[PDB]
Amino acid sequence: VLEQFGFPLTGTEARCYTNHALSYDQAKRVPRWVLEHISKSKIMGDADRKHCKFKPDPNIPPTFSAFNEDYVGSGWSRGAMAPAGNNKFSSKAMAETFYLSNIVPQDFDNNSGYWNRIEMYCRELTERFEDVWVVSGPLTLPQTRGDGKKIVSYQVIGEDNVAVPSHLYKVILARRSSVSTEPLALGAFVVPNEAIGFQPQLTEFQVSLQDLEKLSGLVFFPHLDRTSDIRNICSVDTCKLLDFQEFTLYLSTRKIEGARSVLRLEKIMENLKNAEIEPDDYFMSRYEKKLEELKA
Amino acid sequence: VLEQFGFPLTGTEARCYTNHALSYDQAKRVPRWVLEHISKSKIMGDADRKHCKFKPDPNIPPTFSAFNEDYVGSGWSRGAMAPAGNNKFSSKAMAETFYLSNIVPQDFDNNSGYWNRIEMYCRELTERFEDVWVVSGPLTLPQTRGDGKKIVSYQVIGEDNVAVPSHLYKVILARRSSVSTEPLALGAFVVPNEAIGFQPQLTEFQVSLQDLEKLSGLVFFPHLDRTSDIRNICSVDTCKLLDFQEFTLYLSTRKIEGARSVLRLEKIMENLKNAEIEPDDYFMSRYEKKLEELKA
DNA sequence: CTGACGTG
DNA sequence: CACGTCAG
DNA sequence: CTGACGTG
DNA sequence: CACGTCAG
Ligand SMILES: [Mg+2]
Ligand SMILES: [Mg+2]
Known part of the structure; x- marks a missing residue:
């Protein structure tokens, strides 16, 4: 009787594409999380983003979709969570990263600078680990004012009120090889949605996985064995982004x-x-x- | 192998209790929606809320639960979405409405005044309809600032950062009888989480179902046939709350x-x-x- | 590599 | 809107 | 009805 | 804390 006309729908089911998966936030019109798996082969090929176009995801009910009109002129750039640069191997995969279901409003400088360099480091890791998994997504975090009051504030843009995140997160899980007796490598990072220079090292934005899960209300990689040997990715690898010279x-x-x-x-x-x-x-x-x- | 270690978990699965169901928001530490079915019988009985205590929902992962310490001394009251008064027929159901999974931070006056009177009207409807379904929940809506920017801003309270909603919603669906061919009656309402006097009629807070779904990111009663005639509940019924004298x-x-x-x-x-x-x-x-x- | 912007 | 041009 | 508070 | 007392 209670469910006579159904339970309300939240629309958070995992949506799978050629080379990424995501869960969508219908209220904020942005992904909650976007999961990808990169290897050296995926990041090679002739796929060209100049032949791609940002567009609404045809699988999202239009009532809950973002549209280009929400972004253009807003002062915020379209920031892809699964990057086009991770999908050179397949024109189809790359085009699917231009679905707005993969996009958040992102500061231009951040999108083209610090976040770009983090994405480059994720690709660099495939030179050292056979398999790399990455979960990326938006956050709207509180600020504590001087009197102790904690307040979440964020802009919404366009007719559709697309939420502009205060921060972006990335979780990186790397496996050296299939046969490796070596531990997995794991790092969680939270970066503000703003211009960041070359001075701050990636480790300055590192957080514990448990803290990120509390901040995001998500559980990442839930099938992971909790007694398995996992180490800090920034101790078994460099966590070193490109400097100005190397970035240019x-x-x-x-x-x-x-x-x-x-x-x-x-x-x-x-x-x-x-x-x-x-x-x-x-x-x-x-x-x-x-x-x-x-x-x- | 993208799902090698599982997809991230959002925790939004429907959770079913004796006389209500909810979906929980692990980031905000409140329900997203709470569904109940009310009839004449369920609101009669000897269940007494003085035998109940607010407590964490034992089925919610503690990592994502609210606790009473988050609410006590915060300036906000514990506001139940499925009300105790709808569960006079069962002490077990009533106890489950005091789980903090059913609770949001609610303005005290609103909780004990205007929202209380909306709840009373939902019970009044069982005098004229055999079955009443209600979905209730929190909302965090933007305000348009002087410069045109739209900002969402809300307090989070306690060490667990429980989100204080700017508004509360209720959707009410009423069916005259199980065999009647009368169309169903529906209304959607959005009330600010603040003190509201006796002056505004409930219809001043009415919104279209479509607008509430766009604002909340939810689809309510997905098995309801919206292409058959559905009546505005404030047309076929009164949408008249108790006035000052009757309430007092x-x-x-x-x-x-x-x-x-x-x-x-x-x-x-x-x-x-x-x-x-x-x-x-x-x-x-x-x-x-x-x-x-x-x-x- | 990451994107927006101005002209058609 | 498309598409070449520009910019971080 | 809806809740927060003060004492063994 | 559980309980009794008080307020909207
Ligand atoms: Mg980007
Ligand atoms: Mg209440």
Whole structure:
């Protein structure tokens, strides 16, 4: 009798795509969590975000979907939780990361800077671990005022009132190999949704997993054996993001992956040379292999 | 192998009790929705809330539970979504309504005044409809600031950061009889979590079901056929709360039975007459009986 | 790599 | 809106 | 009815 | 804390 006309629906079921899964927040119009698994093969290939378009997820009821009109002109950028750069292997997978079900309102500088560098480090880990799992998502955390009152405040944007998070979180779980007798590596990080420089190290944003679960109301990787050997990812690995020089270099390399015209190449080396940087052996070895191909 | 260690858990599964069900919000430490079914029989009985105590729900993971320490001294009252008064028929059901999984931080005046009167009206509906279903819960809505920005802002209380809602909602669905071909009657209401006098009629807080679903991120009564004719409950019924005199007389009537001394009983009568409220014959019967017993 | 912005 | 251009 | 508080 | 007392 109680359930004669059904229980209310919260819409939090896991939604699976080609190379990520998420749970959606219908009230805030953003994901609660986005889970991915990266390996060196996934991050290679010819998929190109220039052929992709942000758009509502066709599997989300339109009443609870965000739309591009919510974001454009808002002063907030569209920030993908599963990044396009993790899906070079499949045009379909990359396009599915442009569904707004994967997007939160993100500070432009953060999206293009510190958070970008965290994503780059997650990819770097596949050079050292066979398997890497990442859960990313938004948070709206309280601030404590001087009188002890704790208050959650956040902006909502657009006709659809899309929630702008105060912070973003990432949980990284890395397994060296399938046969490894070695412990798993785990780290949880919470970063404010704002411009962050190159000075603060990633460890300054590290939190215990239990604290993140309390803050987010989520349980991550719930099948994990609690007596298994898990260590702090920042003690068995570096947790070292790219510095300015290496970040500018990396970006330039990503740009030599692409080739459109000569004068473009000119502008590239122009801005790069205004900041010195001696091309290290890697960017050179990757410079000739492409230069030859292009003049061919 | 993306799900190697399981998907993250959000904890929103429906939880069923003797005479209500709820979905719990582990981040805010309050229910998202509480569903109940009321009839003539369930609101009769000897269940007494003086035998009950607010306590954590033993089925909620302690990590995500509220505790009484979060509420005591906070300035906010414990506000039940499924009310004790709907569970006079069963001491077990009543006890379960005092689990903190059914509780939100509620303005004291609102809890004991306007919201109390809405609850009373839900019970009144069982005099004219055989079956009444009600979904109740908290809401944290934005305000539009002077500069046009829309901001959500709410307090979180206690060491567990229990979220204080800005508003409370109720959806009421009423069915005349199980075999009747009369359309069902439905209403949705959104009330601010603050003191509300006797002046505003309940219809001033009515909203369309669609608007409440968009604001709450929920779909209510998903098995209700919305394409068949459904009546506005404030059209087919009264949506009239008890007015000051009726409310005060009802409260005084219930206070008669609790009075422990002649002083307190007599002061109940004095307050009534001081406000120019006339007692009714039933009230004077109970009052004279109790007064005789306490004097003796 | 991460995106928005201005012209059609 | 598309799409080239620009920017961190 | 709805609740918070003060004492063995 | 459990209980009795008090207030909206
Ligand atoms: Mg991004
Ligand atoms: Mg109440």
